[PDB]
Amino acid sequence: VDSSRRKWNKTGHAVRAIGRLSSLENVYIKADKQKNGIKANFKIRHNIEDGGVQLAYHYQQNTPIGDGPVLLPDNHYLSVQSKLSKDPNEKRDHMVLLEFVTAAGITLSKGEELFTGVVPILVELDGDVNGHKFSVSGEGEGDATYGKLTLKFICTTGKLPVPWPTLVTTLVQCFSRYPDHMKQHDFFKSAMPEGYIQERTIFFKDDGNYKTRAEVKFEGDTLVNRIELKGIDFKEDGNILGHKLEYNTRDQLTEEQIAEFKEAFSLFDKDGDGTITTKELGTVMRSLGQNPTEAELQDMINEVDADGDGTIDFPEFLTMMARKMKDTDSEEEIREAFRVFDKDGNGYISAAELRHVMTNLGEKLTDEEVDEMIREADIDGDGQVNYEEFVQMMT
Amino acid sequence: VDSSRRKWNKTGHAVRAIGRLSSLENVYIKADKQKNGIKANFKIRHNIEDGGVQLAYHYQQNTPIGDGPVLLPDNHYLSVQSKLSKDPNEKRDHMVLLEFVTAAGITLSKGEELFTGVVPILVELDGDVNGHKFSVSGEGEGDATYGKLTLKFICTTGKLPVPWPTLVTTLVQCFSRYPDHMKQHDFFKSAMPEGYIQERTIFFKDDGNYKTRAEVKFEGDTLVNRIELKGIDFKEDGNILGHKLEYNTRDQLTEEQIAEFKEAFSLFDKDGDGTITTKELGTVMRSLGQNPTEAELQDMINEVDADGDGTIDFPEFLTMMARKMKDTDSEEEIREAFRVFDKDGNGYISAAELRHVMTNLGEKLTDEEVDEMIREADIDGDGQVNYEEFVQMMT
Numbered sequence: 012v013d014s015s016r017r018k019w020n021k022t023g024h025a026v027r028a029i030g031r032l033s034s035l036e037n038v039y040i041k042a043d044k045q046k047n048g049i050k051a052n053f054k055i056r057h058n059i060e061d062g063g064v065q066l067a068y069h070y071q072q073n074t075p076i077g078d079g080p081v082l083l084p085d086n087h088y089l090s091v092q093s094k095l096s097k098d099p100n101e102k103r104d105h106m107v108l109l110e111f112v113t114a115a116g117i118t119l120s121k122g123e124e125l126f127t128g129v130v131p132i133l134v135e136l137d138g139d140v141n142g143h144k145f146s147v148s149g150e151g152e153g154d155a156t157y158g159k160l161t162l163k164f165i166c167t168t169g170k171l172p173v174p175w176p177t178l179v180t181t182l183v184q185c186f187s188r189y190p191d192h193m194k195q196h197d198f199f200k201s202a203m204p205e206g207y208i209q210e211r212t213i214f215f216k217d218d219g220n221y222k223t224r225a226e227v228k229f230e231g232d233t234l235v236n237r238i239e240l241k242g243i244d245f246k247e248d249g250n251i252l253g254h255k256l257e258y259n260t261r262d263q264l265t266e267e268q269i270a271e272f273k274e275a276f277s278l279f280d281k282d283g284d285g286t287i288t289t290k291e292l293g294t295v296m297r298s299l300g301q302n303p304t305e306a307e308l309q310d311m312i313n314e315v316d317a318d319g320d321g322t323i324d325f326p327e328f329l330t331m332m333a334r335k336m337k338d339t340d341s342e343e344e345i346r347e348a349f350r351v352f353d354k355d356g357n358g359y360i361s362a363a364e365l366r367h368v369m370t371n372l373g374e375k376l377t378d379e380e381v382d383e384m385i386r387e388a389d390i391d392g393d394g395q396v397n398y399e400e401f402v403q404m405m406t
Numbered sequence: 407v408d409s410s411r412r413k414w415n416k417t418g419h420a421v422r423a424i425g426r427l428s429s430l431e432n433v434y435i436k437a438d439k440q441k442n443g444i445k446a447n448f449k450i451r452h453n454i455e456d457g458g459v460q461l462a463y464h465y466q467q468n469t470p471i472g473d474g475p476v477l478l479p480d481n482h483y484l485s486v487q488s489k490l491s492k493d494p495n496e497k498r499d500h501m502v503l504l505e506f507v508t509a510a511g512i513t514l515s516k517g518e519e520l521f522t523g524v525v526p527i528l529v530e531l532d533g534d535v536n537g538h539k540f541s542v543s544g545e546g547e548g549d550a551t552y553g554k555l556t557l558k559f560i561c562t563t564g565k566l567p568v569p570w571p572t573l574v575t576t577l578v579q580c581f582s583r584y585p586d587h588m589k590q591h592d593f594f595k596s597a598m599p600e601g602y603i604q605e606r607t608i609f610f611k612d613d614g615n616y617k618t619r620a621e622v623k624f625e626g627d628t629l630v631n632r633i634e635l636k637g638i639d640f641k642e643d644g645n646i647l648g649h650k651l652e653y654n655t656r657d658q659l660t661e662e663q664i665a666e667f668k669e670a671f672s673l674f675d676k677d678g679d680g681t682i683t684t685k686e687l688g689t690v691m692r693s694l695g696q697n698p699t700e701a702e703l704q705d706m707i708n709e710v711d712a713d714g715d716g717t718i719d720f721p722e723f724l725t726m727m728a729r730k731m732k733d734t735d736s737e738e739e740i741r742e743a744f745r746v747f748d749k750d751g752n753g754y755i756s757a758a759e760l761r762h763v764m765t766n767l768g769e770k771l772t773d774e775e776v777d778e779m780i781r782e783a784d785i786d787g788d789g790q791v792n793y794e795e796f797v798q799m800m801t
């Protein structure tokens with residue numbers, strides 16, 4: 012490569028480095044004290060079909076509905092993982108949405124109490140974009156312990172006149188997971204049950220804007236998000252009215268695979284508080300016969316610890332487990348997993364070894380259920396699981 | 407999938423999660439006050455040819471050679487990236503080694519002054535493993551500003567009787583990069599120029615052990631590491647004497663590609679202190695026409711900030727740039743990079759736009775050199791770079 016190409020590479024690397032650094036779409040929150048609430052600013056990148064991105068610049072204000080005291084936070088952010096899919100049995104225009112949201116950015120009430128378990132959610136939106144009126148209704152549930160939202164939305168007026176992904180931020184941030192050390196900065200939950208008003212302007216670069224106002228509050232045991240949206244100045248053949256935005260990707264974990272990981276997570280998180288501490292991680296590792304030091308345990312957690320709280324929460328765990336792996340590395344991971352099961356290292360996992368491994372993990376199973384696991388894997392019928400049989404179960 | 411397979415998946419995920427969490431091989435350091443030095447503990451995982459891992463449990467003590475005062479640290483660790491390769495022109499049994507080492511684990515002198523620039527290194531080792539005597543000599547240089555070591559080792563007695571990778575930890579931790587907030591915890595540099603004694607026991611699981619003693623000190627301007635190694639109890643057909651350990655991998659960045667990234671890094675790190683601050687990152691981004699907020703800049707850096715010092719150092723930058731990317735994501739990254747160069751967005755990068763982009767990055771080039779870059783990319787000879795021509799330069 013000549014000196015010219017060397018200069019392209021060098022300068023290309025620098026420009027691509029900025030791209031990678033700034034690929035974040037986090038929700039930046041600050042206090043708006045004179046309105047007794049908060050403001051937020053963030054940038055959504057909507058993938059355009061067949062390449063490119065449509066920027067959506069979000070400006071947000073929240074103010075409490077009630078008169079009682081709320082918590083006004085220091086600067087921090089929310090980080091969001093979204094998965095959009097379709098219900099194969101649904102003929103109406105619709106969106107199935109799975110979302111994990113966590114707070115971070117700050118280093119180590121009666122409202123919070125309303126979010127300790129699973130909470131039913133209702134969403135109603137009436138919209139008007141360039142004169143095109145439409146409504147959406149949504150239902151599902153939130154589980155703030157895991158920063159989790161699962162909802163299904165239906166366009167109740169027929170065909171949605173804008174792309175589903177453009178409505179996602181508009182369609183309940185009280186379901187975000189705030190770590191313990193940030194509980195004093197959780198405005199959203201502190202305003203409950205009376206609720207808050209959420210207002211946004213969303214500017215679509217080189218296109219129109221949405222203006223939204225929403226009431227977010229409890230009606231009985233249900234968290235309700237009632238929204239009005241007004242969109243103006245949109246181009247008839249732009250990305251929005253022209254439906255040129257990508258709905259989702261195939262490279263996303265199934266909602267079912269995510270559930271499997273949540274199950275696995277629970278084996279570590281034995282008190283169900285939504286975290287794995289060094290204590291909990293060490294307990295499982297010691298049960299399996301390993302002996303990590305306290306420094307190692309702290310280090311292992313720190314490595315995947317996005318919010319810096321010193322523990323692994325479920326979205327952090329999911330991020331680690333969704334990490335895409337080289338086939339050679341995948342093979343080594345499975346090979347090493349086999350050794351954990353195969354306690355005496357003779358190359359066969361016996362029914363007894365499997366029973367003990369289940370017990371070590373805190374997986375409660377009858378001996379019969381363990382024999383059924385053996386049966387599932389046992390190709391040659393010797394009543395035990397060899398390496399190749401185990402490989403099939405990890406594949 | 408039946409309930410049995412569901413249980414395999416769940417339990418498999420948990421065991422594989424432990425594997426991923428504990429894949430770290432960091433060097434855990436603590437003070438050894440009664441010896442006026444330090445101790446370290448860590449575990450090296452040597453890949454075995456065709457699968458599996460050979461564990462090497464390391465125990466380490468360091469004590470100062472001189473009588474003057476040294477710095478005794480709080481608990482922390484070193485994180486190491488190693489690349490082993492071969493010199494195609496070298497017929498002697500040899501190892502070319504490239505290493506980046508950084509300190510971390512603690513949250514936000516005349517010895518340190520000896521390491522601000524590039525320092526020549528000499529390494530001499532006399533070894534005796536199971537009666538097999540051998541020597542190794544090494545030479546190269548260390549650049550602690552980047553946590554960088556580059557050395558070439560030769561077996562001066564003929565054929566090395568053990569695998570090269572087993573000698574790596576034995577063959578100068580004063581070259582590790584300690585962030586500013588941890589400078590008081592850098593024992594290694596503080597003992598210079600007089601040096602320190604480094605002793606280890608290295609236990610190879612199911613095999614023999616090495617016992618090493620080394621003198622690490624300045625002789626004139628050269629940092630010298632003089633070592634004696636004794637290995638006993640090794641199995642003639644084990645991984646070590648039987649040479650069954652993997653030397654390296656093909657999935658590693660070239661030493662030349664790494665140099666390209668170091669060049670790109672310098673465009674951000676304009677004061678050459680080995681970090682990129684928010685100030686420096688923002689300065690480059692603003693020059694290119696972008697306007698990240700202070701919260702965004704802090705967030706972008708925090709995302710890749712392994713040592714928590716609030717800045718990007720070179721090994722952190724390399725980790726981000728060595729991140730392996732989906733072809734669809736790679737394509738989008740290049741597409742977005744094109745837009746940065748193509749200032750007016752007309753789909754052609756003109757000579758003027760390229761000149762400005764170079765200036766914006768702080769890349770000093772004559773206009774002639776910029777025309778030569780154009781010429782390199784310019785397939786259709788219109789004197790400008792279109793998207794497809796630019797793609798070729800990023801590929």
Ligand SMILES: [Ca+2]
Nearest residue numbers: 280282284286
């Ligand atoms: Ca827990």
Ligand SMILES: [Ca+2]
Nearest residue numbers: 316318320322
């Ligand atoms: Ca955490």
Ligand SMILES: [Ca+2]
Nearest residue numbers: 353355357359
């Ligand atoms: Ca066994």
Ligand SMILES: [Ca+2]
Nearest residue numbers: 389391393395
């Ligand atoms: Ca079998």
Ligand SMILES: [Ca+2]
Nearest residue numbers: 675677679681
């Ligand atoms: Ca700098």
Ligand SMILES: [Ca+2]
Nearest residue numbers: 711713715717
């Ligand atoms: Ca850093």
Ligand SMILES: [Ca+2]
Nearest residue numbers: 748750752754
């Ligand atoms: Ca142009």
Ligand SMILES: [Ca+2]
Nearest residue numbers: 784786788790
């Ligand atoms: Ca051209």
